[PDB]
Amino acid sequence: KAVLEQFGFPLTGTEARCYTNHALSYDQAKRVPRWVLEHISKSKIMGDADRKHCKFKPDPNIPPTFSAFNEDYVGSGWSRGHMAPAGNNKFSSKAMAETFYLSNIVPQDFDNNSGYWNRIEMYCRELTERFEDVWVVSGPLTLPQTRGDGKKIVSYQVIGEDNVAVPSHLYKVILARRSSVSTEPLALGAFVVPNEAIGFQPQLTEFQVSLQDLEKLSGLVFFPHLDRTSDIRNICSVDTCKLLDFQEFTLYLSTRKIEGARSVLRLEKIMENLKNAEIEPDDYFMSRYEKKLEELKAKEQ
Amino acid sequence: AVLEQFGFPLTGTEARCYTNHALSYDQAKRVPRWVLEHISKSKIMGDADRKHCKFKPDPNIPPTFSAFNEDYVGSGWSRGHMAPAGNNKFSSKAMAETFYLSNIVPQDFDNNSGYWNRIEMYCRELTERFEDVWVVSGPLTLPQTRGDGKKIVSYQVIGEDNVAVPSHLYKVILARRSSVSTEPLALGAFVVPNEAIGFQPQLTEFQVSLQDLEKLSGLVFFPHLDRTSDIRNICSVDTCKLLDFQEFTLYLSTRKIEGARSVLRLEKIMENLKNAEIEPDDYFMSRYEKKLEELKAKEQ
């Protein structure tokens, strides 16, 4: 070993990199994370940290030769997709900014990012209403497809001068613990979704896979301290694995759009678009709507 | 409350050390990421014989992430050594460990027995002129540009385990003249396609800058090497000259002698050589006559 290592073994750069509220292993060849691990709780997802103040930027800890840059993504047809979501870090301005490091980012389909993936991220946050602690590992995948001649081929686009790899699929592993003292078994689920528009028809369980199958596909071992001989329950059996439906998701989106409205007229389409959508505003929407209406006419026009 | 209560995910990229090579394994692709070896004049000599060796899963790799012989056999791809078995004649154990599938990538048959073999032979030749030679070998999956300008990485995966077939192979060669010489170190990096190449292109046509290979592979090679020091191009201080068609064919025909088991075989090899317009050299005839006498002394 000493003779082979005289000038050092090659470096792969896969060591875990830790930030305020997430950790990741970086793939220097693909310019994307291999896995991103985070812990979620009800306290962390509340706060005044606001994402419109954040900027995507290269991770300052990654050698520039292996880093992605904004020029790789902009105009590529692919969005900068958070693995550790910025929305999980309302409690800390620093933590949310670090999720905008490109070490946490993969090329993600625009509709997937703002749609099905967003709704999965929302479910993970929803779990904190029922579990005191939730752990999530998210990351990209590049899976094979069978060609016309029967051969299996892995094919993916690389974008920008730096050849950032666009994944065919995205995965999440969710581990939930009811409380730090409870004797209730842990709950776990693994999910793989295509990096494309999905819509509202398929239920989340349709994308569920066994942890062992995901580990074989990804070449990773998740949560290695979990005693797999112990009693560990399927999260979609102990919980709902139910994403927001179209009506719920649209009301949620329309409610958030209120806070960004800068004209009484803009504020009026939101309710108009909503109501014609056969979706009645709930009490929270109307509370935020009237508050914003009063604010807008108290500001310069 | 903390993230690591149940552990960070494991990537399995830690360096794995064997008798005369070390590697980092890619558990997703079922191939090594890099394989490092040290070569010397003493190590490439010995009585270790590759005919006794068998390909087998690396016993240290979790079976769920291992390749198996069933993935390769009948796939159209050969089991290609990264650390060559031929560099380990000094130790049967060291040679057996190069037949662990952790050292193996799916390699084009002609490339394996042809251009890559000739590069491997050049690395061994370097031990005649340098006391110490370090070599890092490994696979690559490089993109190709589509008609619309989009760049696409495409590679086959073979077997039930989806072993990744590389588009290219790389070698990084680091040579030191002696433990006491003040001569600067010599380094070269090379990238060849995983396909038949032939004899027209010289090895320097496949040479790339170390920095370029590191960008393509996502690796940093020989990190203790002081790159601000005086480091020379191996193809400037040495020849980077592979055997040509005549030399390589004579070498192959000479090796075929020792495997000949009929006088009719032994005559075919010499006939083929001559029809190739290549005259046997003195070493060929020495081995040829020894085998002819041997075959006449064996049961017919």
Ligand SMILES: [Mg+2]
């Ligand atoms: Mg997103």
Ligand SMILES: [Mg+2]
């Ligand atoms: Mg070979």
